[PDB]
Nucleic acid binder design. Structure first.
Ligand SMILES: [Mg+2]
Ligand SMILES: [Mg+2]
Ligand SMILES: [Mg+2]
Ligand SMILES: [Mg+2]
Ligand SMILES: [Mg+2]
Ligand SMILES: [Mg+2]
Length: 306
RNA sequence: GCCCGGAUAGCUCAGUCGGUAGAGCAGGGGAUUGAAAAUCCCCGUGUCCUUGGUUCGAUUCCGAGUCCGGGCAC
């Protein structure tokens, strides 16, 4: 029953600023919960905290992967669980910060044990999709596992491939393995969510930030990655907002003005989904990004002195 | 100045053999178990620029005006 804090929130919601200000009055250690901040070399498009901020408040799980190696909600959970153990072992409190809700969830509720990704069976699935379409595969999942086929839409290639993969590797069906649940988070958690008061102030912040990034050398950063020659668009790192568009721009597929437009829209569509996650998230305390930055007080009380 | 194209959804455009119109993008909502900043589901009424003419009926055809792209000319 150790204590832990979750500081969730969409992009451009001032999450980071709040976490370090909290580090000031609470014995907390920061753990980054972000599928893109894990990459080395991806610093400005990911809104990664700068060296000075990191100097003040060290973050765990930052720069732990090369953009060529994918991460997962499961690896995060493992690494997070371990990091939390270390932190609480030192008499302090884990403060998990980020906007990757699926990770927060996997950590909180756990994940039913399933086989990890197998490049080989996925290549075979991709090949059969190019030949017969994702339809033949959905019709095949329908035979072996129809609970899943009713949930997964025939147009969702990621989930479809995933449900077949699990079966082709284990022989056991996806709905069957998921009957066994994962280990819940053995902590007492205080969950907070912070966002600007209006959807449109969020949009303004997203737009002005994108421009600050371009002004800070974002293009140069993405080019260094483009020049490596070993990265591609089926990699999570290259599909990150901003990066995917800039990649299209470097490839000569779109113009500069067009890249800026799509990056901003992509960032807004991302924010919109993060809010969809937070809506209905159980036990969440809402805070406000706009000036109520002095929201550390609501935190202060919900968590009470520690 | 003259000629030729455009002008229809917040943007880029289709379309209507004349019976008041629909895609994509933007935007909104919702899913979400090892790629998740991903992947996917659902939501389309707008003076069809204006004005005359023909017509039961015009955004649609024809004239004219206005604005926007080009071209010709100075
Ligand atoms: Mg047209
Ligand atoms: Mg007709
Ligand atoms: Mg309509
Ligand atoms: Mg949309
Ligand atoms: Mg008329
Ligand atoms: Mg007319």
């Amino acid at each position: 029953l150790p204590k832990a804090i979750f500081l969730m929130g969409p992009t451009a919601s001032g999450k980071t600023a709040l976490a370090i200000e909290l580090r000031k009055i609470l014995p907390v250690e920061l753990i980054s919960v972000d599928s893109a901040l894990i990459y080395k070399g991806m610093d400005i498009g990911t809104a990664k905290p700068n060296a000075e901020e990191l100097l003040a408040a060290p973050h765990r799980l930052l720069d732990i992967r090369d953009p060529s190696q994918a991460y997962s909600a499961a690896d995060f959970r493992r690494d997070a669980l371990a990091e939390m153990a270390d932190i609480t072992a030192a008499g302090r409190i884990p403060l998990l910060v980020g906007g990757t809700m699926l990770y927060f969830k996997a950590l909180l509720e756990g994940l039913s044990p399933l086989p990890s990704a197998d490049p080989e069976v996925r290549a075979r699935i991709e090949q059969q999709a190019a030949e017969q379409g994702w339809e033949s595969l959905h019709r095949q999942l329908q035979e072996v596992d129809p609970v899943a086929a009713a949930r997964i839409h025939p147009n969702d290639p990621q989930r479809l491939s995933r449900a077949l993969e699990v079966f082709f590797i284990s022989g056991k069906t996806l709905t069957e393995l998921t009957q066994t649940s994962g280990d819940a988070l053995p902590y007492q958690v205080h969950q907070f969510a912070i966002a600007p008061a209006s959807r449109e102030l969020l949009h303004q912040r997203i737009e002005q930030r994108f421009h600050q990034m371009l002004a800070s050398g974002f293009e140069a950063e993405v080019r260094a990655l483009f020049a490596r020659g070993d990265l591609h668009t089926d990699l999570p790192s290259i599909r990150c907002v901003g990066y995917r568009q800039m990649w299209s721009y470097l490839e000569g597929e779109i113009s500069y003005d067009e890249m800026v437009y799509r990056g901003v829209c992509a960032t807004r569509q991302l924010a919109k989904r993060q809010i969809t996650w937070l809506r209905g998230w159980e036990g969440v305390h809402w805070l406000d990004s706009e000036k109520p930055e002095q929201a550390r007080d609501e935190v202060l009380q919900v968590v009470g002195a520690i």
